[PDB]
Structures are given as C-alpha cells and as structure tokens.
Structure 1
Amino acid sequence: DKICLGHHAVANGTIVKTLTNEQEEVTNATETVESTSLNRLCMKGRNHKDLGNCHPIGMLIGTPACDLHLTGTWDTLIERKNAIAYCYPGATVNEEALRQKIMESGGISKINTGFTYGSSINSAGTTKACMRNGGNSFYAELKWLVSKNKGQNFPQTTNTYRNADTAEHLIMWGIHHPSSTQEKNDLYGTQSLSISVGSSTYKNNFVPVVGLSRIDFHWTLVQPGDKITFSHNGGLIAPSRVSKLIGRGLGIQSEAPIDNSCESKCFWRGGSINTRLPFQNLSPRTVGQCPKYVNKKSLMLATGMRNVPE
C-alpha cells in the first residue's frame, strides 16, 4: 500500500528568466511590459479641446483658423502637426516659452483692453492674407494702426491698460516691419518711428526695419494693480483684448484621431496607453500617469511553479 505526493504540470510551459537561469520553464507566466497601444486619443471623462488646424499661440492673437478656440475651459488641450498660428508673415519672440505656457493651462478667457485712438489714426486695417467671412480681415485680438490719409505722419499717441482682476494677464502686441520705404511712408509717413513699452515688470524699445511685409509679435505678463504703457508714432499692432490663462491642464501633441468612447491617463505621439502593466516600450516621450519606459521587448513574470513534464 502506497500514497504518493506530487504536483501538477502542463504540456506547454512558458520560459522565464530567474537570477540563476535564463531558460527556466514554468507552468504559467504573464507579461509586464506593454508593446501595443490604441491608435486613438481616449478622452472620456475629460473636458477636452482638439485644436485641429489651430496653433495655441493663434488662439491668443485670434488667427482665422482659431476662431472656434478664442475662449474656453478645459483639462486637456490637444495640439496637432502643421498647425496655423500666423495668417500674416512673421513669428513671436520667445515663441516656445509661450506655447508651453498655453499648453500647460486649463483654459483661456479674454478681457477687453478698452483704449481708443485719434481720428487721424485708422485702427481697422485688414489684409488678403488673413481672410474671414469671404472678405479681408485681421487677427481678431489685435488692431493694425495706420494713418487715415496716405502719406500723413502717424500721431504720437500713448495707450495705457491697468490690471484690476486680482490675477496676472497675458498681453500681446505686434511690430510691423515694412517691405519697402514707399510702403512705410504710405502707412506711417516720413517721420522716424519709435515704439516704447513700459511697465513695472517689463521695459523695452522697438523700431521697424525696411526690407509682402511681416509682423513680429512680443508678449509679457501684467501683474495685478500694475499698469503697462504703450507710446508709439507708427508701427505698433496694438491689442484689443488681453488674455487670462486659467489654472492647469494636460497638453498633448499627437497625430492620432479622437475617441470619446473610452478613458485613458497616458498619451504619446501615436495615441493612448491603457495598460495596467507597470512597464512599456512604445515611447520614452509620454504625458500623464504612465507606465515607465524600458529597453525591453518582453519581461515575463512567473505565476506558477517550475514545469517538469512526463
């Protein structure tokens, strides 16, 4: 009479690595590194904004492509490739610092600056490069200031905006750099041009060059209580409304389509990552609450004993 002790086995066992053995067969194992992702942005439970054709800077200056994104609140802002920031030739100074600041935010709201100009100054300047509703137009949040009569000198004028919202406001203005001298003389006259921007925080001077044209943008933060003074005699593209960035939000840069029928907390250029697994080998560049990137195709965790068949 005999009683035997023993353990189970399986026909096909999986190979795992131990401290002492690279080829160790076990009854069962499970993967710890994820190597597949959804080719889609999973936005369920997220007040999100897909900018599409709009570039984040364009939503502060009011580019035609950004008309639907001048204002809003969000917890997720999604930027796309080849997005339009400028309808008229030019670029913003300290550009990347601004884009980061907007993509970090959780919403945007406009506050009207209010200031007006003299009767000799035309503040309704438009262009064929910046189309809106069929006809010519301009950056919605700024005004192109030119002389009302062609050739007449642009008046020496001083505009000032005070901050009274208990929170810092982002203000943007542009400087026109004419193509030829005749163009410069047509808009602002023969006089020597000089634009001064002055606050407690910010202080700088700008001068148009001569060499169709372009408009460079500049920006700074006006603190609560403090004023900012613009004195100018032609060349300034002055703001109509300043901006207020609200709170905090998750910026995503991706080409993948949106999907509002599922949830995720981790994103990369190619989509979302929905795994419960601790590690991942899709990309080192990820955003949100993610599994950590590793240089490994697979790491098998044994969930069963050593397999000793037949």
Structure 2
Amino acid sequence: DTICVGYHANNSTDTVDTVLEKNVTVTHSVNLLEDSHNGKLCSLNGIAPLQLGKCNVAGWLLGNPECDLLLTANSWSYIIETSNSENGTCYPGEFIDYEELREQLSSVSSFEKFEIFPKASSWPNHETTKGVTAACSYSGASSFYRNLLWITKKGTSYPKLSKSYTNNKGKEVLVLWGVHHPPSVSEQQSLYQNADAYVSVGSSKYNRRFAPEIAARPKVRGQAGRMNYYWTLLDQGDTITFEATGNLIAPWYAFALNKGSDSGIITSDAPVHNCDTRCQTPHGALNSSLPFQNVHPITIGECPKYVKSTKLRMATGLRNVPS
C-alpha cells in the first residue's frame, strides 16, 4: 500500500505560448481576444443612426436636391457616409472650413430646422423667383438648394439691402450663406447692374467685408462662375446683420442644435438593422467582455481596445501531459 501523489490531466489540446517554449498544450485556458462581429449596423442605446446614401454632408446641409429624401431628418446616433456619397455641391465652388464644420458636427445630437427669412415676406424689393441654374437641375427642371436663396434684381433696379436677425432660442444657432460671382463684367452688370459690389457680415465676433472677383477660367459643369460658402455659429443674446449690394445667397433655413457628445462620421456600406448594442465599427457591431478588440480601430461606444495581434491565450491550468 502507498499514497502515490499526482495531478489532474485532460484530453484538451489548446496551446499557449510562453517565453521559454512554443506551443504548450495546457489543461484549461481563457481567451482574451475578439474577432466575432455581425455584418450589421444596429442602433446605439435605442437611438437610430442616420444614413446619407449618395450624399456628402455639405450637399445635405445646403439641401442639394438629390439629397431630398432625408429632408425631415432631425435626430441621429452617428452619421454614416457611404462610398457612393458624392452629391456635394451642385454649383461649382468652394465650401470654406469644411473640416472644422465637420468636427463641430461631431458633438451635435439633434436639430430644430426653421425658416430664417420667410421668402414671401422678407424681400419687398427684389425678384426672388427668377434665379436658378440648369446646372443644378432636378428631373430635368432647373433647380437650386433648399436652405439658401439666390437673389436677383427687380427690373433694372436695386435697393441696397440690409437685414438683421436676432436669436431668442436659447440654444446656439448655425447659419449658412453664400457669395456668387460670374467670370465676366458683362454678366456682373447683367445680373446686378453695379460696377463694384460688396456684402458685409457682422455679429460681434465674426466680421468680414466680402467683394467679388471677375476673371475668366475653364468652366465646370457648363458653368464658368463660382460660388463660395460661409457659416457661423450664433449665441443666445447676440444678433447678426447682413448688408448686401451685389452678391448675396440669402439664408433661408437655420439649425438649433443639441449637445450630447460622441458623434461619428463612419464611412461604410454594410446595411442597417434594428437591434441595439454598445459598440459599433465600420465592419460590424460587437458584443463581448474580453478587454482586447482586434477587428477595427475606429470605434463608437464603450468598446475594448484595438490591438494588432492574433493569439492572446492565457493559461489557467497545467501542462497536460499524458502517460
């Protein structure tokens, strides 16, 4: 009789690497790495996301009328651009500080869109209906943006324009506007009847005098002129004044904004579904508790951390050695 002493053994074959040795077959282990994900993009914390489709963000906020379907959108979890998202600006030009605008979008949650200057009332001086381009056409019909307003003269006449606007909505208000210029002096007089012209934008902290330019250039989309774009955050209290002579693209819609951080500009093309998670990638959604994520670095939510490895098995057990 004897009391021979020994340890447990298994039939398992998961291997853990150590420093002194590779591929050690251990009894029991525990994973620490993730790779599983659906190919779906679910809502975050119950709140639906937003998809633009074939729409750049700038084309959406200006209301490029190919982006007409998502007109009544007001609340999102995170904005999804697509690979096919290309309807930016219809009229050729330049949207100044587009990047800074996109990061100020990254901490807004919802909207209150409203008429700034009511088109039937605010303009008792000028023809506000004979201005459109065929380059920004829509189903054949010559069309225009949905938040702006082209302004024309009224029968070889121009009263000098001035207009204020006040904030009394508590939250901050974002206001856009634009400046047109043609490439020829003849067209410049043909629309505006002024040798020189100027606008001025002033609130308290933004202030600039704008003046057009007239210069020939190769046309794009059948248009040789250009149009620049500008935008400013307002505050409660402080007011804004526009004062125009020749080249005004009048604001016609504003936005009241809402806080609540962590918004994203994830670009993917996986479809949208209607479950709920706490983590979201371009390649899918996650559901885990291991502290290391391997799928993709760009995350939204409370996600575990991105690494660049393959196998991170941690051994909790013995050297499984048969006899």
In structure 2, the partner of 1:161 is: 165
Distance 2:282 2:317 in 1: 37
Amino acid at match of 2:6: G
CA contact (8 A) 1:124 1:143 kept: no
Deviation at 1:3, TM superposition (A): 4.3
Q: Is there any run of 5+ residues in structure 2 with no aligned partner, and where?
A: 216-222
In structure 2, the partner of 1:202 is: 206
1:33 aligned onto 2:39: no
CA contact (8 A) 1:73 1:108 kept: yes
Deviation at 1:228, TM superposition (A): 0.7
1:254 aligned onto 2:267: yes
Amino acid at match of 2:229: F
Length-normalised TM-score, structure 2 = 0.85
Distance 2:21 2:68 in 1: 62
In structure 2, the partner of 1:51 is: 52
CA contact (8 A) 1:79 1:254 kept: yes
In structure 1, the partner of 2:142 is: 136
Deviates more, 1:201-210 or 1:277-286: 277-286
Instruction: Give deviations 1:179-203, integer Å, cap 9, x for gaps.
Output: 3222222111232011100111210
Say which structure is richer in strand: 1
Length-normalised TM-score, structure 1 = 0.89
Of all paired residues, the percent bearing the same amino acid is 36
Deviation at 1:124, TM superposition (A): 4.9
1:290 aligned onto 2:294: no
Deviates more, 1:246-255 or 1:91-100: 246-255
Distance 2:272 2:202 in 1: 47
Task: Report matched runs for 1:1-310 at 5 Å.
Answer: 1-18=1-18, 21-43=21-43, 45-70=46-71, 71-81=73-83, 82-114=85-117, 116-132=122-138, 134-149=140-155, 152=156, 154-211=158-215, 212=223, 213-248=225-260, 250-310=263-323
Distance 2:287 2:50 in 1: 20
Deviates more, 1:31-40 or 1:288-297: 31-40
Q: What's the C-alpha RMSD, in Å, of the aligned pairs?
A: 2.4
Amino acid at match of 2:249: I
Amino acid at match of 2:108: S
Deviation at 1:304, TM superposition (A): 2.9
Distance 1:281 1:230 in 2: 52
CA contact (8 A) 1:13 1:27 kept: yes
Distance 2:130 2:34 in 1: 56
**Structure 2 residue matching 1:122: 3-state secondary structure:** coil
Amino acid at match of 2:319: R
CA contact (8 A) 2:55 2:86 kept: yes
Distance 1:40 1:240 in 2: 38
Distance 1:261 1:118 in 2: 49
Instruction: Give deviations 1:98-156, integer Å, cap 9, x for gaps.
Output: 1222243212221222262243443552222323465222111110012233xx36431
Distance 1:4 1:21 in 2: 29
Distance 1:125 1:309 in 2: 87
Q: Is there any run of 5+ residues in structure 1 with no aligned partner, and where?
A: none
Deviation at 1:287, TM superposition (A): 2.5
Amino acid at match of 1:117: W
**Structure 1 residue matching 2:103: 3-state secondary structure:** helix
Amino acid at match of 1:64: P
CA contact (8 A) 1:153 1:190 kept: no
Amino acid at match of 2:147: E
